[PDB]
Amino acid sequence: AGILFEDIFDVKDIDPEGKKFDRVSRLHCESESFKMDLILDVNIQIYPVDLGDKFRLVIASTLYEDGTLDDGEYNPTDDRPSRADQFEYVMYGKVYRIEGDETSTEAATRLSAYVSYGGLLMRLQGDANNLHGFEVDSRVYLLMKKLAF
Amino acid sequence: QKRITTPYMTKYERARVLGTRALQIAMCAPVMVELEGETDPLLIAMKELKARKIPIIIRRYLPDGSYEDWGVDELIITD
Amino acid sequence: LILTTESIMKKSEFLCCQDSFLQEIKKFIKGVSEKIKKTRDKYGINDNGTTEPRVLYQLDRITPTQVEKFLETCRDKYMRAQMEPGSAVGALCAQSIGE
């Protein structure tokens, strides 16, 4: 189980600066286990997220538990039951611009990470040890699912 | 004898050498390469330069009158 | 990093250009090193190379293999940036104020 990161987030704000696009909107989330600011963009036409909802976000690679790492992705083939059928939102992007917090000039331990899913941006902040992997160049799959309780 | 000139091959001399070779090959000259089926000896004149098989010596003249001999194979072709 | 840069710079090929360009690149290579120390004592990192947080070494990573190719590429670009001997500078500069 190559899980890079997994947590439960709640949306505090959504699209604060009016509205510019017609299919994409900004999302502001927060957590309870570890203090962290998660910002991403998701399609509203497909995934109609609203205000004040709790979802589960998982960043990982190698969907199939069987293979070490496969060459090419096949759309309808289901040889190995992966983690995508249990969730409801899948993305495939890459990390870049590994920088940290610049406000605290002296000793701090807060690190940030930027991911680009082919145009849609994602910003993560949090603890140093919480980010275990998250290499500079890494192809990572994002998984989102609504948790209504 | 020590060379006091840049070793990089100029485009001004590259063009003139290419023109001279193209004009000479069209004069029923012995080719210095096994060419593919293709006309327009200008097109194959660059092939000999890319393989460094052009028997031409470049003489660079200085303002005073000094002569400097350079080989096409000794020059560095950059592109 | 400073000793590696000044060791690889003192070579038989690098002694062909102006030392003004070499001092200009020494001003930039020295300034990059000051950016690394502030980030290293920013969060707290020992340079011996054994600290269980693994991501703190990926902020500004400079390896000695990729620093040689950078120097070679910039030095070779400075070779081609020189004007070719034989160019018509008068006619070229005459039309630059035309349009």
Side-chain angles (χ1 to χ4, degrees):
Chain A
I3 291 283
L4 274 77
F5 180 74
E6 60 96 21
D7 203 76
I8 305 170
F9 294 78
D10 60 78
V11 178
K12 292 291 187 183
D13 200 275
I14 170 169
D15 204 1
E17 291 149 326
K19 198 171 185 176
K20 270 78 72 177
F21 312 106
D22 293 332
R23 293 182 182 94
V24 180
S25 67
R26 299 267 170 173
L27 271 301
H28 293 261
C29 320
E30 209 172 22
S31 289
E32 294 100 0
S33 172
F34 301 111
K35 302 287 99 174
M36 57 184 49
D37 202 77
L38 184 146
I39 302 180
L40 82 166
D41 312 300
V42 296
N43 200 328
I44 293 295
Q45 183 180 4
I46 293 179
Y47 178 70
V49 64
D50 52 348
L51 188 70
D53 196 1
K54 276 189 177 184
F55 66 100
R56 195 185 189 176
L57 188 132
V58 177
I59 297 170
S61 77
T62 302
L63 281 76
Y64 322 111
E65 281 91 309
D66 275 27
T68 45
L69 60 91
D70 287 330
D71 205 298
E73 196 269 333
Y74 216 104
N75 298 334
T77 293
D78 46 351
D79 290 319
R80 279 77 44 87
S82 62
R83 302 167 185 167
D85 56 355
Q86 309 180 43
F87 287 97
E88 285 189 353
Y89 195 76
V90 180
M91 277 182 178
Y92 168 72
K94 52 176 305 188
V95 181
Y96 81 110
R97 196 68 212 283
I98 293 296
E99 65 183 1
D101 195 13
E102 303 310 282
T103 66
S104 176
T105 314
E106 194 61 27
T109 186
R110 183 183 292 272
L111 276 190
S112 66
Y114 295 83
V115 189
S116 178
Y117 300 97
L120 304 188
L121 264 294
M122 189 178 189
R123 183 200 197 184
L124 310 169
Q125 292 189 318
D127 192 86
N129 288 319
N130 276 339
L131 277 75
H132 175 40
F134 270 97
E135 298 169 348
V136 173
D137 196 345
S138 314
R139 299 295 179 92
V140 293
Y141 292 83
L142 181 68
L143 302 98
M144 185 182 288
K145 156 166 179 164
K146 258 186 178 178
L147 271 178
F149 64 97
Chain B
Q1 173 189 107
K2 186 54 68 179
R3 295 152 169 178
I4 62 170
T5 321
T6 175
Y8 289 81
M9 184 171 193
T10 319
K11 55 175 184 182
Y12 287 72
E13 53 195 8
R14 181 165 146 186
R16 183 171 173 183
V17 166
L18 260 55
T20 302
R21 188 52 180 183
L23 195 141
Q24 284 193 348
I25 292 181
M27 287 289 212
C28 280
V31 196
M32 294 298 105
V33 74
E34 183 67 26
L35 49 91
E36 294 291 329
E38 52 197 0
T39 63
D40 190 352
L42 163 60
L43 281 181
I44 68 172
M46 297 183 285
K47 225 171 184 177
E48 296 179 350
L49 182 85
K50 293 179 182 180
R52 301 177 177 179
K53 289 184 173 185
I54 295 189
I56 288 174
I57 298 177
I58 298 184
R59 173 157 288 188
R60 302 173 169 177
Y61 266 90
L62 280 73
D64 59 351
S66 179
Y67 70 102
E68 196 143 8
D69 281 319
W70 271 91
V72 169
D73 294 331
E74 288 200 38
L75 287 178
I76 303 178
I77 309 102
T78 42
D79 60 353
Chain C
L1 181 61
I2 304 296
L3 63 86
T4 301
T5 282
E6 294 301 322
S7 299
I8 198 170
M9 189 176 289
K10 293 296 290 183
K11 275 283 189 178
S12 83
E13 199 275 335
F14 286 101
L15 297 190
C16 295
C17 294
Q18 294 179 358
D19 189 74
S20 45
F21 176 78
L22 295 187
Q23 291 181 355
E24 214 72 22
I25 199 171
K26 280 186 273 286
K27 300 288 99 174
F28 170 77
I29 295 180
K30 186 187 291 292
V32 170
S33 296
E34 329 291 347
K35 177 160 80 91
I36 302 185
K37 64 175 181 66
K38 58 182 287 186
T39 309
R40 186 151 290 185
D41 55 28
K42 175 80 66 66
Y43 309 84
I45 290 169
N46 50 339
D47 50 38
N48 49 13
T50 301
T51 315
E52 62 90 22
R54 189 73 269 193
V55 184
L56 271 71
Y57 279 101
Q58 295 179 357
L59 268 54
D60 54 271
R61 163 178 139 187
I62 292 300
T63 61
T65 295
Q66 68 186 357
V67 75
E68 158 189 351
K69 309 178 189 175
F70 167 76
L71 296 182
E72 197 273 338
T73 308
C74 68
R75 190 264 315 149
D76 188 57
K77 274 184 171 188
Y78 197 78
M79 288 292 193
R80 303 204 267 190
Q82 290 202 333
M83 199 158 189
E84 64 272 0
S87 179
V89 292
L92 268 177
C93 83
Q95 285 174 158
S96 315
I97 314 100
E99 62 270 14

